[PDB]
Amino acid sequence: NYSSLNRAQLTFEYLHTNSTTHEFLFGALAELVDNARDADATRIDIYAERREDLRGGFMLCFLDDGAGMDPSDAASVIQFGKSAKRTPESTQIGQYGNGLKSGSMRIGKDFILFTKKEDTMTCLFLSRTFHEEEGIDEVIVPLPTWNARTREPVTDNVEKFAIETELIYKYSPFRTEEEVMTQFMKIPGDSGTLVIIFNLKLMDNGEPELDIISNPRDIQMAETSPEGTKPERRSFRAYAAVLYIDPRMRIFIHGHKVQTKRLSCCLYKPRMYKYTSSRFKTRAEQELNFVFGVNIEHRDLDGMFIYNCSRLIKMYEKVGPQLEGGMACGGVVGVVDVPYLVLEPTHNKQDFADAKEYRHLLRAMGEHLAQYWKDIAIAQRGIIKFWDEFGYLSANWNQPPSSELRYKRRRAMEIPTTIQCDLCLKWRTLPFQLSSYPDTWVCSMNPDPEQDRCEASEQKQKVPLGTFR
Amino acid sequence: MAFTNYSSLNRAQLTFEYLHTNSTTHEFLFGALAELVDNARDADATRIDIYAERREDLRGGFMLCFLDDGAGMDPSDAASVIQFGKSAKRTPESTQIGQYGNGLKSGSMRIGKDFILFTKKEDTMTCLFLSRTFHEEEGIDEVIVPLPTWNARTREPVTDNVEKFAIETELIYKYSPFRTEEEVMTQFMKIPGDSGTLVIIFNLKLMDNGEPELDIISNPRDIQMAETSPEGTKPERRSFRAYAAVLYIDPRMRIFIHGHKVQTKRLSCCLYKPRMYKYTSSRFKTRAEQELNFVFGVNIEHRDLDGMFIYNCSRLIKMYEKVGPQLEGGMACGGVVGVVDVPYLVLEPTHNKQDFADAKEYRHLLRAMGEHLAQYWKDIAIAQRGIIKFWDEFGYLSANWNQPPSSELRYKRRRAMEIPTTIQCDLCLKWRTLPFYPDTWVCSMNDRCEASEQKQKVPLGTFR
Ligand SMILES: Nc1ncnc2c1ncn2[C@@H]1O[C@H](COP(=O)(O)OP(=O)(O)NP(=O)(O)O)[C@@H](O)[C@H]1O
Ligand SMILES: Nc1ncnc2c1ncn2[C@@H]1O[C@H](COP(=O)(O)OP(=O)(O)NP(=O)(O)O)[C@@H](O)[C@H]1O
Ligand SMILES: [Mg+2]
Ligand SMILES: [Mg+2]
Ligand SMILES: [Zn+2]
Ligand SMILES: [Zn+2]
């Protein structure tokens, strides 16, 4: 019996400490997006409710239709390190039992989480404002639960429930049980979770770091856009478009669907490479698919995109010839999905915990990328002439090519444009040319007579496998 | 300032797996080690000894021991160690590196499965035992941490609960490298002064091949990363001796690795034609309502070891960061080492203290540094000489850039005439410049220990 022994405890300042892991704020947001995906949500809505009385002038809301959380799961949310997703063969991104807390405390001072399950709706309130105002060094988290049908309290302690609800009304954007019930009603199905981050972090100028004004359809970083800054790093729409290698959950930003894209599908001459990783085999004792392709659309947006369990960890990583001053292998996008048995993510899921094995994987990627360069033989065809074939005659490299319809279609018909249905969530390849943000497309709108119906099996692209060496 | 009682409300809690979660912040293992080195420095230690005690029965084959002569810890501070986020150092105008109340735990759990910390203060000897082995063996999901205290003089237990003390000591004897109170007191006696702390990380993480990540065999004087060092690998990233040599911009604590002193070096003190630059940051001015010194110089000794070294509160956060012309294709500003000490009011470190929490303001600082580095290049005006000719004057006549310069005594002395070799006394910790060593050196071996530390004030350049 170890009841009398000391326990490691969380202090209020540890919320900020944990939040410090996210120097990439879109990574903090991706924590909540990953949680929604793990919850089997078919849909996550990322929108802002204007609130001029709250720091930043608006709340950041993550509404998903996933499995939600019963009171036990909601309580486990504040068990740092607790992750039921940490399971063998798990396809769930979450493993560290930390992402929600770290990301939410990076995004804003306070977050209030509304979750609904079979017949229970639970509110989880993490208010650093409450802690600072009332001088609390622990991390006290109200966790009231109502019956999702009767809306009556579900508690073994009416005193505790009253204190929790009064704290919510005092320190949250919602001053009454009626406003709280409105938030719950925003969860339309039998299950789902709404995470509202409010009192958002301000920059030096007093403006919120998240800019939702420049583009009402996007969550942007409040900061200038250098010529080399990447859309996935300045635009959360662009980030969420590639956040997952297997996009199944629909992402909506300010009510506008994010056009998720598989980076492999948008490349010229893709060649998959089966790398028999000694790391993977050693931890099996206890293969990887490198997909390389030329980004004719944006030769600037080249680099390795390393996913870990379908979730983007590294983006625009330069490997192999991309590291040298010569542009050889320039414009090539590499994508690899690394399972947990090969690599684990860092604390913020923006890097890999095992630096040595990540370096080994990057070296393997560089070797296979050089092999891909030799295989496609566009150097044998002439690299600059190949680029000119798609309108890249500008002396500069990064900025896009001449957008005249000639080269536009030359690139388009070399890129099989795929789309996802808004109802069955399956991905289809279209035989025509799209006109333009995404639509509410469904399988019924596919002119392809072979797959024009909803029940049609997903015709899966099979990248032509290449052999290393 | 609470309106009511919150005893019944749920508290966020640490689970056993959160130890690993926290440890995952350190993809850089030497950063995990630097957490303990920073703690020793914050404890005002004059020296920290980083040595390996061979233990074939423990995973990795040896224990990693951090022995410092700092202020140590009374039982209250030792208890506060496991209060995640608790940092008494997090105070206004604090020179102490620690602010997040996390470094020890994150770094120790990154380095090894278990760590046992022995700390001594006025008359108390406290042991803090963080044993993930114990938790795994006994199915503990919380983080239970034994924290027995002995009277440093009588060696008697200091506890308000003899049952708790007995359980803590039995857990230590069962799951730690030290199976008896005699061995525990032997560890305590390794703290020779009235105060100090000994942190022993054991059951070290193994690589895939079953070897420990920390290689203490290739170089018995160094703690190395167990891995091949490609041409571009940096010594500070593969050698912990090299890392600790530059871990702090103000080296005052002596660092010994395997009993061998680390020759700490101020990167700004060994550059050719250094020019400090006064940069005023609106963030600094604001949070003062609540200047930065960019030092640029040419690394003639190793022009390949060039880049910005960003220190935060005297502690290295970013190393070899490329800014300004260093990012383009060409050797303009090549070989330039830039050093800046950013106070906490200007930037805060990330969770692992290997990056800066405010990415936007870090980018602003890097842009300012690049502008000032271009200014430095125009100021020294190597066009007077030509970049290649200037490099050749110091032995860089090889067509390649990365490879070191000529070892001929001519060029060696040519370089030495530009970099006044500075030395730190082993008795008073003061730094002296000699006109013209591994074991030790004092002011008498030049001057005396009572002489004021002459400061090498860099010339001041002008930006625009
Ligand atoms: N949107 C959500 N829907 C359902 N359950 C959720 C949601 N967000 C969080 N949870 C639950 O709360 C737990 C804690 O979240 P989090 O702190 O992100 O840990 P994790 O997701 O398990 N692991 P990681 O994200 O790698 O730290 C999750 O593991 C889920 O059980
Ligand atoms: N070697 C040491 N000597 C004395 N006190 C120490 C030592 N190591 C740790 N401590 C104490 O234990 C506390 C917790 O250590 P740590 O987890 O490193 O947090 P911190 O050093 O306060 N801040 P950070 O390193 O930024 O997380 C310190 O703040 C000190 O009070
Ligand atoms: Mg998560
Ligand atoms: Mg510390
Ligand atoms: Zn369909
Ligand atoms: Zn002296």
Author numbering:
A (entry chain A): 5 to 290, 365 to 514, 519 to 551
B (entry chain B): 1 to 290, 365 to 510, 519 to 528, 534 to 551
What do the study's own words say?
To determine how phosphorylation of MORC2 affects DNA binding, we purified a MORC2 phosphodead (MORC2PD) mutant comprising S725A, S730A, S739A, S743A, S777A and S779A mutations. We determined the structures of MORC2PD and MORC2 ATPase domain with (MORC2PD-DNA, MORC21-603-DNA) and without DNA (MORC2PD, MORC21-603), in presence of AMP-PNP, at overall resolutions of 1.9, 2.5, 2.4 and 3.2 Å, respectively, using cryoEM. Although there were 2D classes where MORC2 was bound to the DNA in the MORC2PD-DNA samples, these could not be resolved into a 3D structure due to low resolution and absence of diverse views, suggesting that there may be an increase in flexibility upon DNA binding despite similar global resolution observed in DNA or DNA-free samples. Interestingly, almost all CC1 was missing in the DNA-bound cryoEM structures indicating high flexibility of this region upon DNA binding. The dimerised ATPase domain is well-resolved in all the cryoEM maps, but no density is seen for CTD to model in the full-length MORC2PD, MORC2PD-DNA and MORC2S87A maps. MORC2 constructs containing either phosphorylated or non-phosphorylated CTDs did not induce large structural changes in the ATPase domain upon DNA binding, revealing that the ATPase core is highly stable in the presence of AMP-PNP. The observed flexibility of CC1 inferred from its absence in the DNA-bound MORC2 cryoEM structures and crosslinking mass spectrometry, suggests that CC1 may aid in binding and compacting DNA. The ability of MORC2 to bind DNA through its multiple sites, combined with the flexibility of its CTD relative to the ATPase domain, explains why it is hard to determine DNA-bound MORC2 structures.
The Microrchidia (MORC) family of chromatin-remodelling ATPases is pivotal in forming higher-order chromatin structures that suppress transcription. All MORCs share three features: an N-terminal gyrase, heat shock protein 90, histidine kinase and MutL (GHKL) ATPase domain, a central CW-type zinc finger (CW) domain, and a divergent C-terminal domain (CTD) with predicted coiled coils (CCs). MORC2 possesses multiple DNA-binding sites that undergo structural rearrangement upon DNA binding. Importantly, MORC2 mediates chromatin remodelling via ATP hydrolysis-dependent DNA compaction in vitro, regulated by the phosphorylation state of its CTD.
